[PDB]
Design an enzyme around this catalytic site. Structure first.
Site, PDB file in Angstrom:
ATOM      1  N   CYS A  40       0.835  -1.365  -0.092  1.00 43.74           N
ATOM      2  CA  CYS A  40       0.072   0.051   0.008  1.00 43.74           C
ATOM      3  C   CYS A  40       1.027   1.323   0.109  1.00 43.74           C
ATOM      4  CB  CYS A  40      -0.860   0.024   1.174  1.00 43.74           C
ATOM      5  SG  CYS A  40      -2.072   1.380   1.198  1.00 43.74           S
ATOM      6  N   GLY A  41       0.539   1.935  -0.994  1.00 42.72           N
ATOM      7  CA  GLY A  41       1.240   3.322  -1.149  1.00 42.72           C
ATOM      8  C   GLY A  41       1.178   4.376  -0.221  1.00 42.72           C
ATOM      9  N   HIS A  42      -0.064   4.592   0.335  1.00 39.54           N
ATOM     10  CA  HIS A  42      -0.404   5.346   1.675  1.00 39.54           C
ATOM     11  C   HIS A  42       0.196   5.002   2.893  1.00 39.54           C
ATOM     12  CE1 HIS A  42      -3.685   7.115  -1.261  1.00 39.54           C
ATOM     13  NE2 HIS A  42      -3.296   8.291  -0.916  1.00 39.54           N
ATOM     14  N   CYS A  43       0.421   3.645   2.747  1.00 39.46           N
ATOM     15  CA  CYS A  43       0.758   2.996   4.160  1.00 39.46           C
ATOM     16  C   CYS A  43       2.310   3.152   4.111  1.00 39.46           C
ATOM     17  CB  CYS A  43       0.588   1.485   4.303  1.00 39.46           C
ATOM     18  SG  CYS A  43      -1.285   1.039   4.284  1.00 39.46           S
TER      19      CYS A  43
END
Ligand SMILES: [Ca+2]
Lengths: 863, 461
Positions: free
Chosen positions: B35-38
């Site tokens: 996950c990019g946001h993570c």
């Protein structure tokens, strides 16, 4: 078992009976129309000769047929009747008629057969008729179940005693008798059979006055239900009257009385015996092969005649001996020889196996092609056994000249283990030896090319105790080997794909511990989604879409869309997840990229269904990475993996001035193919390895890829009819495959066209026969189609993303049905009637995904 | 015994209850490895965790891999990634979801807002001005009595909503500064009308209904920033204005959109998207639009199935757009299925031409026996059938009830029938129910006639 009683006769009385037996062969619509067969009728005298002085129900009766005649069953034979103007003697032969009319002794204890007596030197067919008649006198007046010996062998029998009748039901499946025959346990490729045997004893004033017996045999091809047949055989024995008979004979034992009646009387078995047709003026194997070989040219395997000859010749081989087979093999040329190896291996007898094993030297490099054909034929063997496995095990343990062939042997051993495991032989000695050899050969990690061999074998054998190794290799991150293990897991049944399996596959998909290849990850997710995925299993895969590398988002989206579109098992749980906007929305479901997945129907009926599946993973470059085409066939719950064709590629980016994906710049340029045919994983074939080998081979002309004859359907029954007659049912399904590929490629024009033509010819034959040695009736049918499936791929690669138009095209196919019925007399042509029907099945295109249709619109635009 | 990956606890299935017991206050990040946001949040999370390690108290920062520990994610109702949930272990029955900003600062400032008061007391007009200026949306409660019933209601609504700052003033100079005679509650925002005055009874419930309704802007631009906010919300009907930044009179065009947005505040999310942007090309394809067909509007509903809707008109004045949304909301707009243009003379020839638009109208006509060829224009099988199908039309051109038709299955979508090969012949009898009979007989004029005359019984059951 000395409490029941059967027939009782009066002293000094002669019983005067009539006896009739007839047989009918029918195409078996359910209502019997214009059939073939014959009726044998006679008078019958029965006299009690002796009774045990101990007062026990122990009697010796004498049975005589007189006035024997043979007649038509069909009333419209007229001037075509085979019996016209011929005496019973001329029909059966002087010596036969005398034999049939000679008396017979039956020693009965408690109404059951203790011994049967007859003259030793008589024809088998005739002794069978006599045994048939004698068997009717064995019975029971009360209800119960028991085991009895008669013409039909040792069978379990049930008696229903009613008021004016007793019913004798014989369990034909339980009969112990030595009769050749076989039938595949695979529902999709099999033939269904029903055998009934019912004898009714009519009672008047507590005594039997008549006996009516009817025996039926019904067969039907599972795959196609217009291919069926029926045998009906009846018997009628009626008491007319009694007369003053011979006086009882005196003695303490039955045996002494018999010697006194006539010393030529010998105890012979009541059980019916096999007899050979005894061919008179029939050509030998070599003579037959001389004609057959004209049709089995490599040039015309596609014609229905080729397949017809193949199947016909297999019947001959099934009666030939090692030497005549070995001879034919030894004198044949290089071109036709592969076809003959197909036929010889299909025969599947001790003699044919030994002839081919002898003929083929596994150390030779000159007979590589024939080694292959032999081994593939064993893969498709309709009824394999421990002997075939043993031969293969030893070939492997022996010396083999080509390592490709050594691999092939291990791969086919895999299928044989599978087949014998599904046929109650999982604990057979050679099976346990081959299991140890696969499972063991996969633990002792040798060279990399050796692990691949074992994995492919296990891909066929599908032993559940092999799963922990498969998980180890799927997770290993070892590229080609990891994919292989993954695809093998993919063949197991749902109860074997447990939570622990799915736990591993999740780590592979999600990369919780380490990086895995895209091909491995996608395959792992496919197994998860296909095997009772949990809510979170599906949820996590859905949430990943949009957060993976370029083409993998498109591919996984396509997988999920296909589950919805085709209502696959996990459909319901996916729809549950799709309720949530966070997972299901026009942002996540808006993907660019070429990758796809589409399932359609080839055919669907209330009973049976056929599916096609195309899923393609592309590289970022736009060059193919992995395509899977799968065709499955279903009949009810039963399934068959008719076909799989997997195409892999890497490092082809240089063939345009394109660049490899991130990481792939060290990948050597490669293209291969892996295939399954009728549940059999074949040895994968490399098209080229490395750049120099690629630039080495090379264009747009047809190229043979697979060519061969296969015996797919194979059903055989040899039957002892209760009447004494001999009956044979044979159903064979053969086909010829002829796949050919062509490619046009222009870099300057940025265009590509690939055509793969699969030419398939099917012939399904049936044969029913009843033989009595002096007369024979047969019903045979032939059904044939010359089918064709083409896959075309048109690529315009000027601008990424490229225009790709795929087409699946089924050709118009000829469909031809043949029927031949006959009644024949041991000499002469007899009565023959033949019919011919010839229709045409219409062609079509199969749609793929809608995006493909869009790209085909453009490719075939009016200008 | 979890590890402190940059002073952040690693919580697993086996060790989650133990660590939940060992801290009174726990902030858990549910994340995914891909996950990019993570990924973007991971180091800021490590910062706020590290800053509280050498300065904090009892609040401990933890993370769970939801793709590995999926039971946990399900058990606590995780939506997407990441999800940050605050656990007290005084209420194991529901943690509180973090909704604020993703900076390491915003975190600790949100944690202290758990311990401090729901609203700041605003003693004067300058303090009011400050708070109003601090956020995009701010709410002030004007209550003479701070202990009041009304005022205790408002202080409850200010603990619930965590993404907006709340203020309470009992000073009359502040009241008069914002023009309030009586007690009341005012929402301030830096868009649209700027100010919304609460009406009716001062209940916690009536407050949330007012705030949530008035907090949302009229129009939202679609971006990688706004996307998770859009799909995180509760409005499941969106209208998209595909507006290229290069178009002439951008402001005027968006203006009409903003207008129409008013009439449907709580009901339809009005979104605009830059049709020229490279990132948006995939989205254009999803709505079957080309860069050259913009500007345009499309309405979509987001349920088990996503269903797209097209306006009857192409005009983009505030009126047409409202008219569109209104007719949609009534039931008078049909789902947008792919369809070609119905030719002027579609019924001039013996064989009728059907498209997606008029298919159900013709085929499922109760009084007509309709026989349809479904074909692909490039297919040779379909090309070969064409002369025979023409002769079949010719045979029935004056019939009382039989209609011979054809449709290009690759250019038109029909929900009622699935086409599994080309060509497919399907019979739709004159019937009250929508019966469909598959024809699998000979493709010959003779076969066709036998089937038609038997009413669909001799060629298919
Ligand atoms: Ca109709």
């Amino acid at each position: 078992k000395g409490h029941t009683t059967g027939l009782s006769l009066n002293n000094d009385r002669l019983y005067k009976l009539t006896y009739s037996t007839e047989v009918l062969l029918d195409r078996g619509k359910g209502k019997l129309q214009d059939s073939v067969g014959y009726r044998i009728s006679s008078n019958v005298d029965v006299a009690l000769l002796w009774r045990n002085p101990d007062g026990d129900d122990d009697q010796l009766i004498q049975i005589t047929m007189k006035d024997v005649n043979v007649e038509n069953v069909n009333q419209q034979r007229g001037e075509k009747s085979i019996f016209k103007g011929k005496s019973p003697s001329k029909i059966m032969g002087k010596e036969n008629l005398e034999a049939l009319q000679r008396p017979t002794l039956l020693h009965l204890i408690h109404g059951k057969v203790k011994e049967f007596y007859s003259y030793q030197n008589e024809a088998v067919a005739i002794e069978n008729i006599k045994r048939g008649l004698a068997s009717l006198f064995q019975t029971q007046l009360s209800s119960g179940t028991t085991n009895e010996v008669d013409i039909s062998g040792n069978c379990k029998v049930t008696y229903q005693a009613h008021q004016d009748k007793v019913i004798k039901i014989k369990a034909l499946d339980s009969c112990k008798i030595a009769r050749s025959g076989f039938t595949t346990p695979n529902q999709v490729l099999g033939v269904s059979s029903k055998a009934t045997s019912v004898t009714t004893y009519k009672i008047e004033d507590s005594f039997v006055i008549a006996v009516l017996a009817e025996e039926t045999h019904n067969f039907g091809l599972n795959f196609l239900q217009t291919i069926k047949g029926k045998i009906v055989s009846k018997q009628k024995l009626e008491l007319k009257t009694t007369e003053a008979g011979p006086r009882l004979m005196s003695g303490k034992q039955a045996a002494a009385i018999i010697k006194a009646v006539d010393s030529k009387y010998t105890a012979i078995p009541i059980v019916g015996q096999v007899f050979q047709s005894h061919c008179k003026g029939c050509p030998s194997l070599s003579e037959l092969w001389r004609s057959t070989r004209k049709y089995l040219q490599p040039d015309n395997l596609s014609k229905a005649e080729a397949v017809r000859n193949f199947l016909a010749f297999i019947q001959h081989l099934r009666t030939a001996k090692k030497e005549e087979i070995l001879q034919i093999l030894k004198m044949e040329n290089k071109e036709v020889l592969p076809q003959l190896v197909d036929a010889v291996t299909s025969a599947q007898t001790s003699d044919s196996l030994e002839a081919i094993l002898d003929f083929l030297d596994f150390k030779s490099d000159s007979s590589i092609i024939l080694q292959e054909r032999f081994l593939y034929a064993c893969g498709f063997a309709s009824h394999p056994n421990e002997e075939l496995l043993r031969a293969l095990i030893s070939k492997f343990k022996g010396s083999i000249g080509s390592s490709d062939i050594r691999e092939t042997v291990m791969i086919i051993t895999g299928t044989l283990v599978r087949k014998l495991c599904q046929n109650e032989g999982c604990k057979l000695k050679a099976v346990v030896e081959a299991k140890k050899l696969i499972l063991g050969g996969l633990e002792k990690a040798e060279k990399k090319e050796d692990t691949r061999m074992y994995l492919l074998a296990l891909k066929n054998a599908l032993l559940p105790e092999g799963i922990p190794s498969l998980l180890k290799y799927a997770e290993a991150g070892e590229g080609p080997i990891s994919h292989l293990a993954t695809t093998a897991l993919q063949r197991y049944d749902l109860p074997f794909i447990t939570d622990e399996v799915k736990k591993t596959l999740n780590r592979i998909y999600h990369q919780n511990r380490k990086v895995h290849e895209k091909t491995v990850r996608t395959a792992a997710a496919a197994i998860i989604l296909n095997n009772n995925p949990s809510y979170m299993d599906v949820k996590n895969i859905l949430l990943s879409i949009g957060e993976l590398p370029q083409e993998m988002n498109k591919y996984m989206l396509a997988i999920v869309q296909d589950i919805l579109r085709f209502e696959m098992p996990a459909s319901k749980i996916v729809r549950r997840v799709l309720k949530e906007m966070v997972a299901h929305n026009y942002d996540r479901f808006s993907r660019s990229g070429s990758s796809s997945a589409y399932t359609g129907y080839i055919e669907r009926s209330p009973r049976s269904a056929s599916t096609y599946s195309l899923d393609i993973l592309y590289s970022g470059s736009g060059i193919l990475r992995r395509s899977n085409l799968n065709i499955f066939q279903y009949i009810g719950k039963a399934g068959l993996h008719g076909s799989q064709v997997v195409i892999e590629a890497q490092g082809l980016e240089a063939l345009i001035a394109a660049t490899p994906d991130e990481g792939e710049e060290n990948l050597d340029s490669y293209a291969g193919m892996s295939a399954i045919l009728f549940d059999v994983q074949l040895r994968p074939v490399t098209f080229f390895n490395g750049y120099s080998d690629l630039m080495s081979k090379m264009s747009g002309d047809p190229i043979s890829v697979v060519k061969g004859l296969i015996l797919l359907i194979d059903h055989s029954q040899e039957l002892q009819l209760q009447s004494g007659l001999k009956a044979n049912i044979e159903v064979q399904g053969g086909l010829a495959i002829d796949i050919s590929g062509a490619m046009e490629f222009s870099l300057w024009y940025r265009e590509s066209k690939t055509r793969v033509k699969n030419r398939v010819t099917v012939v399904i034959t049936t044969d029913i026969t009843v033989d009595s040695s002096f007369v024979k009736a047969g019903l045979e049918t032939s059904t044939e189609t010359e089918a064709g499936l083409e896959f075309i791929s048109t690529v315009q690669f000027s601008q990424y993303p490229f225009l790709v138009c795929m087409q699946m095209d089924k050709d118009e196919a000829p469909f031809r049905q043949f029927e031949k019925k006959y009644e024949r007399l041991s000499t002469g042509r007899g009565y023959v009637s033949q019919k011919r029907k010839e229709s045409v099945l219409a062609g079509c295109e199969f749609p793929l995904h809608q995006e493909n249709s869009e790209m085909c619109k453009v490719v075939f635009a009016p200008q | 015994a979890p590890e402190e990956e940059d002073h952040v606890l690693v919580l697993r299935k086996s060790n989650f209850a133990e660590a939940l017991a060992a801290h009174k206050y726990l902030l858990v990040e549910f994340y995914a490895p891909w996950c990019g946001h993570c990924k973007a949040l991971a180091p800021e999370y490590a910062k706020a965790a590290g800053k509280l390690k050498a300065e904090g108290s009892e609040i401990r920062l933890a993370k769970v891999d939801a793709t590995e520990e999926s039971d946990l994610a399900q058990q606590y109702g995780v939506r997407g990634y990441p999800t940050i949930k605050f656990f007290r272990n005084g209420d194991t029955a529901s943690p509180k979801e973090y909704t604020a900003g993703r900076e390491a600062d915003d975190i600790v400032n949100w944690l202290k807002k758990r311990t401090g008061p729901a609203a700041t007391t605003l003693p004067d007009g300058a303090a009011a001005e400050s708070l109003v200026e601090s956020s995009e949306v701010a709410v002030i409660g004007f209550f003479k009595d701070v202990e009041s019933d009304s005022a205790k209601q408002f202080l409850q609504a200010a603990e619930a909503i965590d993404d907006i700052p709340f203020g309470i003033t009992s000073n009359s100079d502040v009241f008069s500064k914002y023009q309030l005679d009586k007690d009341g509650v005012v929402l301030f925002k830096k868009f649209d009308e700027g100010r919304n005055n609460f009406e009716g009874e001062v209940t916690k419930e009536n407050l949330l209904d007012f705030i949530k309704h008035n907090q949302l802007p009229l129009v939202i631009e679609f971006t990688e920033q706004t996307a998770p906010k859009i799909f995180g919300g509760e409005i499941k009907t969106h209208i998209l204005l595909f507006l290229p930044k290069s178009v002439s009179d951008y402001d005027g065009k968006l203006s009409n959109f903003k207008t129409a947005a008013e009439s449907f505040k709580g009901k339809i999310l009005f979104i605009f998207i830059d049709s020229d942007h490279t990132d948006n090309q995939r989205i254009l394809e999803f709505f079957g639009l080309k860069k050259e067909e913009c500007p345009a509007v499309r309405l979509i509903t987001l349920e088990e199935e996503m269903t797209k809707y097209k306006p009857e008109s192409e005009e983009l004045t505030a009126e047409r757009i409202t008219e569109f949304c209104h007719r949609f909301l009534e039931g008078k707009i049909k789902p947008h299925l792919m369809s070609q243009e119905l030719p002027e003379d579609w019924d001039k020839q013996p064989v009728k031409v059907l498209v997606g638009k008029n298919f159900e109208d013709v085929a499922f006509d109760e009084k007509k026996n309709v026989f349809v060829e479904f074909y692909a224009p490039w297919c040779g099988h379909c090309k070969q059938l064409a002369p025979i199908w023409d002769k079949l039309g010719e045979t029935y051109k004056d019939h009382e009830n039989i209609v011979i038709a054809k449709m290009d299955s690759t250019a038109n979508e029909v929900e009622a029938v699935k086409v599994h090969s080309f060509p497919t012949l399907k019979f739709f009898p004159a019937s009250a129910d929508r019966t469909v009979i598959d024809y699998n007989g000979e493709r010959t004029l003779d076969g066709f006639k036998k089937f038609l005359e038997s009413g669909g019984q001799d060629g298919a059951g």
